[PDB]
């Protein structure tokens, strides 16, 4: 989904 590092 969101491609940042969560």
């Amino acid at each position: 989904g969101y491609p940042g590092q969560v």
Partner: antibody
Framework: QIQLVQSGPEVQKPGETVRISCKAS????????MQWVQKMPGKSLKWIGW????????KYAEDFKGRFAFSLETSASIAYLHINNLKNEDTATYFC?????????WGQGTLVTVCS | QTVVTQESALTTSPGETVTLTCRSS?????????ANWVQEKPDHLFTGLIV???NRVPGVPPRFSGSLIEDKAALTITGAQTEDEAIYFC?????????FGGGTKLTVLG
């Protein structure tokens, strides 16, 4: 208990370079990405980009990629923002903020003043 | 090109419910915009409130909630407190960049 502590205000002349630090505590530094945000005086916020703290790979906003760069000192839990060839319009408060998705925890901000 | 629009200012009183909205100039806000809400108090003291449309940041009091209403992202404060007087910014994710709204100055009477 999670805290992001940024370095102090900087004053510079056009054409100079600055390095802003963001020291993280209270979580495993390498497990969540670090974002950077610019707030120009009186105005709203612009995303500069993020850096992945596991892989070191950054992602930049288009307007910032030429003179704004991220780095890590992973062993010290520090993320850095480097601004080169400073312009008058770079005068702003800069924030680091931890993912996510987005901006969960915020540093206190670092004011960079470029003297015109 | 995409612009994110928030109410410039709202006023509430203690114990009221107030809803702030966040509109995209491209069309409807959806869960794929991962809407954030953050709070600014003096001096440039930011805290996270909501990320990912409706996820409340740890430690944020339960009177804050995020949702989607009528194609906008929305922050609802159910039972406003005087300590909620602040500027509230939303941010939306568009595939490859975050875009912030202009902020809402929330006044709390009392």
């Amino acid at each position: 208990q999670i805290q992001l502590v940024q370095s102090g205000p900087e004053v510079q002349k056009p054409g100079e370079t600055v390095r802003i630090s963001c020291k993280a505590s209270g979580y495993t530094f390498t497990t969540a990405g670090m974002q950077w945000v610019q707030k120009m005086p009186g105005k709203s916020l612009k995303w500069i980009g993020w850096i992945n703290t596991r892989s070191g790979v950054p992602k930049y906003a288009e307007d910032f990629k030429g003179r704004f760069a991220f780095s890590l000192e992973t062993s010290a839990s520090i993320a850095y923002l480097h601004i080169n060839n400073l312009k008058n319009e770079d005068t702003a408060t800069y924030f680091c903020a931890r993912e996510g998705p987005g901006f969960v925890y915020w540093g206190q901000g670092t004011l960079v003043t470029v003297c015109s | 090109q995409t612009v994110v629009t928030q109410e410039s200012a709202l006023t509430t009183s203690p114990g009221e419910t107030v809803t702030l909205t966040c509109r995209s100039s491209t069309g409807a806000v959806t869960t794929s915009n991962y809407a954030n809400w953050v709070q600014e108090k003096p001096d440039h003291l930011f805290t996270g409130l909501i990320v990912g449309t409706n996820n409340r940041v740890p430690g944020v009091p339960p009177r804050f909630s995020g949702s989607l209403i009528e194609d906008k992202a929305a922050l609802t404060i159910t039972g406003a407190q005087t300590e909620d007087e602040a500027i509230y910014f939303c941010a939306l994710w568009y595939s490859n960049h975050w875009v912030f709204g202009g902020g809402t100055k929330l006044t709390v009477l009392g």
